[PDB]
């Protein structure tokens, strides 16, 4: 109740801009808002795949037959809504506002590879109906914990957002969280219990970065999220395993 | 072979399908004009509940960004994904005007909202108000990266006149009993009706004319129509057993 609030406020985590920079870079799909070309005066929403380029600018592969493509050609001002955990309503949600710009011929090759890195089977991007567009950010806004005590919000300029680096350990979140959630969830419960002093019934690893990881934990009927910081910054894929064993050894 | 079965299988009309799916949805993506960032649109996740006419009811906090957006410009849109993770699924965008609910309509609107969000106790707090998106146009797209790409739009009058299918409300219990315990029965029915030797058949939704399934042979969706319209919950069980016997 009060121990959770005191632990979360002190636990090491990425800075706000690095968290938003990292979550966006790891995201591959979101909700595009445009000005409706056909229904004048109304906005319009659609689902789009995307991939951030090296600067964090979303790359879209848009079909000339899509409604949202016609919207963007008539008015390039748009927004992109990202949900870290789409089903979690208390999760982090990011809105990137910017201007959709056709990618130049010089930039085609770098843009195409950045997009296929996130959508490896998207070989329609070479078809004539499809073009790459880049949403050049104007402002990046986020909200977190809507119906919770740890409600936070903020915004970043284009310059602040682009200067932040993507955390180099977050890319390993999927393999690490799988091996732990499938085979070694007892270890996660002990580590969380050792650090937070909460005897959690279950501890599910949500994400991962160089400073630690977050877990979905359950105690009685309440479900809540806990930050589990590493004793030091993780340096690589293997170092993440080393630190988990060290935190387990410090408990087990 | 799939295309010939899908084009002939009985299903709800387009406007009744969209009316039914929207009425069954309780969360979506709201697009607004950004009050703070002049010239830009904005997106947010919102809970909602359709009223009896199909108009989405929102319970908005005075502290939320999208509330300030809607108060500055009521013109908005609501994006609903029947199966949000299925990229070929049906997606509906309702465009309309967000209107404060009047004092006379508060009670009916509150009950419509709590029917879909029974634990939303905060709707009574002072920070919260009910808004209704009065529809201007309802647009849909389906099978966006498939051979069966379809689209269309409905006026406010066409959308409001359509009825919500009275059997779709039973989709969750029926699909649970079948997908967990009787997927062999579902596979037999699908193979019997479509003449497709399906390896697995996962029941997706339900209406009075049949149900849709996710099937795999050597992944695609198949419509499984009932031999006649189902009249109630028990009749759905009667018809499924009847189709299994065949």
Indicate the domain borders of chain A.
1-162, 163-252
B106 three-class SS:
helix
Checking chain A for breaks where C and the next N are over 2.5 Å apart, the residues before them are none
Is A63 annotated to bind a ligand? Reply is yes
Across the interface, which of B30, B37, B45 has its CB nearest the CB of A97? Answer: B37
How far, in Å, are A204, B76, B214 from residue A35 at the CA level? 40, 10, 34
Chain breaks in chain B (C to N over 2.5 A) after: 218
State the pairing for strand pair B75-81/B27-33. antiparallel
Cα–Cα distance list, B218 to A11, B6, B32, B198, B215 (Å): 49, 19, 44, 9, 10
Q: Cα dist. B108→B51, B99, B131, B156 in Å?
A: 8, 15, 13, 21
Structure-determination technique: X-ray
C-beta neighbour count of B158 within 10 angstroms: 15
Q: A183 Cβ partners below 8 Å, 6+ apart?
A: none
- Do the Cβ atoms of B40 and A78 come within 8 Å? yes
Name the β-bridge partners of B81: B91
CA-CA-CA-CA torsion sign (B157, B162, B163, B165):
negative
State how far the Cα of B86 lies from the Cα of B161, in Å rounded to an integer.
29
CB contact under 8 A, B87 and A138: no
> What φ, ψ does residue B134 adopt, rounded to 5°?
-75, 115
Q: What is d(CA A16, CA A156) in angstroms, rounded to the nearest whole number?
A: 9
State the maximum Cα–Cα separation within chain A, in Å, rounded to a whole number: 63
Rounded to an integer, what distance in angstroms lies between the CA atom of residue A105 and that of residue A113?
14
Q: Of B42, B81, B137, which is closest to A39 when you measure between CB atoms?
A: B137
Question: Given an 8 Å threshold on Cβ–Cβ distance, is A43 in contact with B93?
Answer: no
What H or E segment, with its residue span, contains residue B174? helix B171-181
Cα B1 to Cα A251: distance, rounded to the nearest angstrom: 60
Task: Give Dmax over CA atoms of chain B in angstroms.
Answer: 63
Dist CA B19 CA B138 (whole Å): 9
Contacts of B67 (CB under 8 A, 6+ apart): B60, B61, B129
CB neighbours of residue A32 within 10 Å = 27
SS3 A107: coil
Distance CA A209, CA A172 (A): 8
Q: How far apart are CA A194 and CA A113, in angstroms?
A: 43
| Neighbour count for residue B239 (Cβ, 10 Å) | 18
> A35 in contact with B at a CB cutoff of 8 Å?
yes
Out of A39, A42, A77, whose CB is closest to B40?
A77
Whole-angstrom CA distances from B34 to A153, A189, A197, B31, B137 are 16, 43, 43, 9, 21
Closest CA to A53 of A135, A128, A170, A129: A135
**Rounded CA gap, A187 and A193, in Å?**
10
A95 touches chain B (CB under 8 A): yes
Cα→Cα distances B132→A95, A203, B86, B97, B101, Å: 24, 40, 28, 8, 6
Contact A248, A180 (CB under 8 A): no
Question: In chain B, which residues have their Cβ closer than 8 Å to the Cβ of A97?
Answer: 34, 37, 40-42
| A153 Cβ neighbours under 8 A, 6+ residues apart | A141, A142, A143, A144
Instruction: Say how many CB pairs under 8 Å bridge A and B.
Output: 93
3-state percent breakdown (helix, strand, coil) of chain A, nearest 5:
35, 30, 35
**Which of A 136-155 lie inside 8 A of B, CB atoms?**
138-139, 141, 143, 147
Shortest CB distance from A44 goes to which of B31, B42, B84? Answer: B31
Residue B97, CA distances (Å) to B25, B135, B209 in order: 19, 7, 33
d(CA A75, CA A71): 6
DSSP state of B207: B
Helix, strand, coil % over all residues of chain B, rounded to 5: 35, 30, 35
Query: Alpha carbon A202 to chain centroid distance?
Result: 24
Q: What is the DSSP string of A145-210?
A: -TTSSS-EEEEEEHHHHHHSPPPTTGGGHHHHHHHHHHH-HHHHHHHHHHHH----SEEEE---BT
CB distance B245 to B192 below 8 Å: no
Question: B215: closest CA among B194, B240, B241?
Answer: B194
Give B77's contacts in chain A (Cβ within 8 Å).
Answer: 33, 36, 42-45
Q: Contacts from A106-110 at CB under 8 Å and sequence distance 24+?
A: A108/A132, A110/A53, A110/A54
Interface touch B95/A36, C-beta < 8 Å:
yes
Pick from B65, B81, B95: CB nearest A44: B95
Q: B95, A39: Cβ pair inside 8 Å?
A: yes
Instruction: Show Cβ contacts of residue B162 under 8 Å, excluding neighbours closer than 6 positions.
Output: B13, B15, B16, B18, B19, B54, B154
Q: Which of A45, A65, A90, A100 to mutate to test the interface with B (most CBs of B within 10 A)?
A: A45
Cβ(A56)–Cβ(A25) below 8 Å = yes
- Cα distance between residue B191 and residue B185, in whole Å: 10
Note whether A27 contacts B: Cβ–Cβ < 8 A: no
- For residues B27-50, one letter each, b for 16 or more C-beta atoms within 10 angstroms of the residue's C-beta and e for the rest, the string is bbbbbbbbbebeebbbbbbbbbbb
B63 has a chain A CB within 8 A of its CB: no
Give residue A45's Cα distance to chain centre.
Answer: 20
User: Which of A42, A88, A122 would best serve as a mutation to test chain B binding (most B beta carbons within 10 A)?
Assistant: A42
Per-residue CA distances from B32 to A45, A232, B155 (Å): 9, 43, 20
Phi-psi region of A178 (alpha: psi -120 to 50; beta: other; left: phi over 0): alpha
Dist CA B241 CA B185 (whole Å): 9
Query: Is there a contact between A143 and B65 if contact means CB atoms under 8 Å apart?
Result: yes
Annotated binding site of B for heme b, which residues?
61, 65-66
β-bridge partners, A83? A93
A183 backbone dihedrals φ, ψ, rounded to 5°: -105, -25
**Contact call for residues A190 and A200 (beta carbons, < 8 A):** no
What residues of chain B lie within 8 A of the CB of A68, using their CB? Answer: none
């Amino acid at each position: 109740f009060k121990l959770i609030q005191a632990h979360e406020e002190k636990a090491a985590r990425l800075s706000p801009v690095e968290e938003i920079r990292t979550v966006l870079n790891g995201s591959i799909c979101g909700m595009l808002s445009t000005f409706s070309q056909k229904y004048e005066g109304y906005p319009s929403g659609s689902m789009v795949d995307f991939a951030c380029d090296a600067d964090g600018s979303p790359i879209l592969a848009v079909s000339s037959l899509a409604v949202h493509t016609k919207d963007l050609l008539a008015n390039p001002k748009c927004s992109l809504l990202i949900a870290r955990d789409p089903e979690d309503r208390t999760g982090l949600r990011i809105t990137l506002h910017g201007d959709a710009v056709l990618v130049s011929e010089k930039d085609q090759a770098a843009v195409r590879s950045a997009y296929l890195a996130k959508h490896p089977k998207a070989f329609w991007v070479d078809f004539g109906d499809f073009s790459f567009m880049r949403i050049e950010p104007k402002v990046v806004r986020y909200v977190s914990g809507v119906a919770t005590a740890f409600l936070g919000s903020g915004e970043f300029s284009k310059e602040e957002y682009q200067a932040a680096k993507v955390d180099p350990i977050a890319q390993y979140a999927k393999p690490v969280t799988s091996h732990m959630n499938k085979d070694h969830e007892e270890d996660t419960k002990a580590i969380v219990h050792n650090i937070t002093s909460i005897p959690v019934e279950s501890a599910l690893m949500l994400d991962l970065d160089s400073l630690g990881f977050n877990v979905k934990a359950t105690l009685q009927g309440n479900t809540f999220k806990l930050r589990v910081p590493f004793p030091r910054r993780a340096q690589d894929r293997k170092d993440v395993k080393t630190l988990i064993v060290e935190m387990l050894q410090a408990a087990k």
